[PDB]
Every structure is written in C-alpha cells, then in structure tokens.
Design a binder for this molecule. Structure first.
Ligand SMILES: C[n+]1cn([C@@H]2O[C@H](COP(=O)(O)OP(=O)(O)O)[C@@H](O)[C@H]2O)c2nc(N)[nH]c(=O)c21
Ligand SMILES: Nc1ncnc2c1ncn2[C@@H]1O[C@H](CSCC[C@H](N)C(=O)O)[C@@H](O)[C@H]1O
Length: 467
C-alpha cells in the first residue's frame, strides 16, 4: 500500500479562525501557471545576459521555498513582500556557477576540457568587466599558469585534473566573486520584483472573479485545544467550472478549457478519499474536479513539470505513535493529516497549512523537509519553540541529508539541541516505484520522551523497516 488514511491524528492545536486565502479556481490557477512560466523565462534571460550562464539547476524552485520562509505577501506560490529582497539561496547558487558551471565529470578528457573552460572563462571575465588591478593580476597569473601546463605535455589522472580545477577555482573564486557580486545581486532583486508585479496581477484577477460571483471578501476568541483539522476558508468558494475527466491507461486526464493535467488513477482515488475526509463545503462533489485540476496544476507549476518508504511510516506509527507529516503534499502524504505548502488548495485534501505556521501543543510527528537550507533552519527554530512552549507530549522524528562538508545550520543545531533524545545515520538501498545516508534525529520534550521514548527495541524495529 502507498498510504494509510485510516490513522487518526494525535496532533493537538489551538482552534483556528478560518483562513483568509482567496478560494482557488482553475481560471486563476492557469494565470498563475502562465506567469510563473514567464518568470522562469525572465530568470533564464537575466542569467544569460548578465553572466552568460544557464540558471543553476533547480535554483528557481529552491528560491520559491527560501522566499516563502520570509514572504508576507498575498500569493500562495510566488513571493512579493520579502525582507531581505536579495535571496541568499539564489545568490549562493548563481555565484557557485560563475564564471562557469562545474558539470559532472566521468571521463578524464571531460575533466581536462572543464579545467580549460574554467580558465578561459575566468580570463574572458577579467578582460571584459570592471575588476581591481590586484584581482586582475591574480586571476591572470593563475589562468596563464594553467594554460601553460595544459599546452605542455603533462601527466594527470581525472582526479588530478579535478584537483587542479579545484585549486584553480580556490585561487580565482574570491576574485571572480567580487567581480560578479553586484551583478548577481541584481538578478536576485530583479526576479523578486518581477514576481511581486505578477502577484499583484493575479490578486487583482482573483478579486475581480470573486466580485463577478457576488462573493464578498470583507468578512471571535479561540480558547480551546482540539485535535487538528484541515484548514477551512472563510471566503465562500466560487461556483464549480467545467472540468472534463476521462481515463487513459490508468491515468486520470482532467481538462479545463483545453488545458490538460494528468495524475495517476491511484492518486486520483486517494484524492477522492482525502476530499471526503477533509472538505466540508461540497457534499455532492460538484467542486471536486475543479479543485483537483487546481491542485495538480499548482504542484506542476511549483516544480516545473521522494517519500519515506511505506514500511518506515508503518514503523514510525507503531513504534513511536507518529500520525502526522510536517512536510507533505496531498499527492505524497502517508497520513490524512499533514502540513503542506498550499493550504488555499490543499486544505480541501487534508492540509493543516504550512509547517512554520502550524502550532501543535501535542502529537507525534515525522518531518522530511525539502532540500532547502533556509527552510530547514527555520524548521529547527520552530521545533525548539514548540517543544519549549508545551508540557503535553510532543515528538518530532526528523530525516535530513547527511550534509557534513559543509554542514548545514539545521543539522548542526539539531545535534546541539537540549531536546535531542537519539540520532542515527541510515543508508537506504530500496526505493519504491511509482506507476550518503540520512540523518534521523529524535527531538522530544520530557512528556513526549516519557510517552514515545527511543528505546533499543523501538529503534531496532525502525531500523528493520529502513532498508
Ligand atoms: C551537497 N549539498 C547540497 N546543499 C544545498 O543544496 C543546494 C543545491 O546543491 P547542488 O550541488 O546544486 O545540488 P544537490 O543538492 O543535488 O547536490 C546548495 O546550494 C545547498 O543549499 C548542501 N548544503 C550544505 N550545507 N552542505 C552540502 O554538502 C550540501
Ligand atoms: N512550508 C511547507 N510546509 C509543509 N510542507 C512543505 C512546505 N514547503 C514545501 N513543503 C512540502 O514538503 C514536502 C517534502 S517531500 C516529503 C514527502 C513525504 N510526505 C515524507 O514525509 O516523506 C513536499 O511535498 C513539499 O511540497
């Protein structure tokens, strides 16, 4: 099986006012998709025109995640009100690819060609851009030195070329960085400001749509602890629109005005159950296909086009009482209760909203965050705040990459946390099909430690499931 939606929550929260998100509609989701495509195209053009490189692979997606750590703006996907304006994530990634991206190397000839390509690009940079005399002579020295060695008869393995390249990059990098720093900062700021303008246009289109539906957007003390429940929207949803569904080779194909999105039949059936469990404004499923269309399109837009193995979730539930994923989507969730990036659309399918906004007083949780350093670091701060704030049983079992060279602040801080009860590293070789190692950290307050202690037997059962 791929999920266990029968497991009830043990997450406990203060009851919530309904959220103010504008209710989703395919016409708006399509516009957001089109503008996000244009934004990616602007990013490509800025990287090419200003630095002669392709956008670092997956950097835009990580930018979306880092921006949402600080974004106070009105769009569920795109950023528009962020301090600082310049993303440290996008800045870091672009700078690492200047003057060229270091590709993956398999052959010694490709290692030799990359060494040459770096030296040549560094020289082109020094000859054509504003650079201090000191930085110019250092880069020039190192480049001509590499060129003279390459032009000679030499002896090197691919490892020797790569180390030669690493040493040349070591010598040139600080100087190349100082040359490009202001230009790269300008790419980061410009793409943010274009995004904010797109957010404004999407917002105006969405408000106009609601007004056309005669739906008002202008619409109490919360003093009880309740078991968690999906995010509810205060604004009435607009009427369903025409979305056509048919199946092709066990793929659900959903068409809105000629725009097709696809999801596997298994995921479609899962979404139908999640909706039955999570949606309270649509008893005859009239809005269901509209919302599935928005959901699929939203997640396709987010990424541009893995989860723990099921036996691990089973063992987390049986051995440590886990009922809830801090990082998930309706498509990948194992439990019917989870946090996700997009409560405006995911709440209908069980989302409790984004994790940094989620405030559990109690519960046993799993957390497998996106590979985003800034989100991971904010996650840890949030863990420590929650664990210190409540005396009810609270446990987080956290899976992050073994980033050691260099370390990432989230892992370093979790290893120094006063709430750490156990830690281990797990290599994994069995990966599920869908038709080095992982650091596992147990953070628990005293009550959670008493209730879900990482004893030897429980850890052994968890490791037995983690192949
Ligand atoms: C391997 N690695 C990747 N990252 C983060 O992931 C981003 C993308 O790194 P990448 O090398 O472009 O791709 P990869 O993650 O698939 O290897 C980086 O800019 C970092 O934010 C890493 N961050 C830290 N601190 N340490 C690491 O060893 C490390
Ligand atoms: N702010 C946020 N809050 C909660 N989840 C988020 C988030 N930002 C991104 N995510 C989601 O985090 C998930 C990480 S993949 C996690 C897979 C699976 N639920 C597991 O626990 O193993 C993705 O679905 C991603 O969309």
């Amino acid at each position: 099986v791929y999920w266990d939606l029968d497991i009830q929550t043990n997450a406990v929260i203060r009851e919530r006012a309904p959220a103010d998100h504008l209710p989703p509609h395919p016409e708006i989701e399509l516009q957001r998709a089109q503008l996000t495509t244009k934004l990616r195209q602007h990013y490509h053009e800025l990287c090419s025109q200003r630095e002669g490189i392709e956008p670092p692979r997956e950097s835009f997606n990580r930018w979306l995640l880092e921006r949402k750590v600080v974004d106070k703006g009105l769009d569920p996907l795109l950023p528009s009100e962020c301090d600082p304006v310049i993303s440290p994530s996008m800045f870091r990634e672009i700078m690492n690819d200047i003057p060229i991206r270091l590709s993956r190397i398999k052959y010694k000839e490709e290692a030799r060609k990359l060494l040459f390509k770096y030296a040549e690009a560094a020289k082109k940079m020094i000859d054509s851009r504003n650079v201090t005399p000191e930085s110019r002579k250092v880069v020039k020295w190192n480049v001509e030195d590499t060129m003279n060695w390459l032009r000679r008869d030499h002896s090197a393995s691919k490892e020797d070329y790569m180390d030669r390249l690493e040493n040349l990059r070591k010598q040139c990098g600080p100087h190349v960085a100082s040359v490009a720093k202001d230009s790269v900062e300008g790419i980061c700021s410009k793409i943010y400001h274009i995004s904010a303008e797109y957010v404004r246009r999407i917002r105006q289109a969405h408000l106009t749509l609601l007004k056309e539906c005669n739906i008002s957007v202008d619409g109490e003390v919360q003093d009880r602890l309740v078991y968690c429940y999906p995010v509810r929207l205060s604004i009435p949803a607009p009427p369903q629109t025409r979305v056509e569904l048919h199946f092709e080779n066990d793929i659900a194909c959903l068409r809105f005005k000629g725009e097709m999105v696809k999801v596997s039949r298994g995921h479609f059936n899962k979404l139908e159950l999640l909706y039955r469990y999570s949606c309270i404004d649509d008893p005859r499923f009239e809005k269901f296909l509209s919302r599935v269309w928005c959901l699929i399109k939203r997640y396709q837009v987010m990424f541009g086009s893995g989860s723990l193995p099921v036996p691990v979730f089973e063992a987390l539930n049986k051995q440590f009482g886990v009922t809830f994923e801090c990082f998930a989507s309706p498509l990948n969730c194992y439990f019917k209760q989870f946090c996700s990036a997009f409560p405006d659309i995911d709440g209908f399918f069980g989302s409790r909203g984004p994790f940094l906004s989620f405030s559990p007083a109690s519960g046993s949780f799993e957390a497998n965050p996106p590979f985003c350093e800034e989100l991971m670091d904010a996650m840890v701060t949030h863990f420590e705040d929650l664990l210190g704030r409540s005396s009810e049983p609270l446990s987080f079992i956290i899976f992050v990459p073994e980033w050691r060279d260099p370390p990432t602040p989230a892992l370093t801080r979790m290893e120094a946390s006063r709430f750490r009860r156990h830690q281990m590293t797990v290599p994994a070789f069995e990966h599920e099909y869908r038709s080095h190692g992982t650091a596992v950290i147990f953070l628990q307050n005293n009550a959670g430690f008493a209730k879900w202690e990482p004893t030897t037997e429980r850890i052994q059962e968890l490791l037995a499931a983690y192949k």
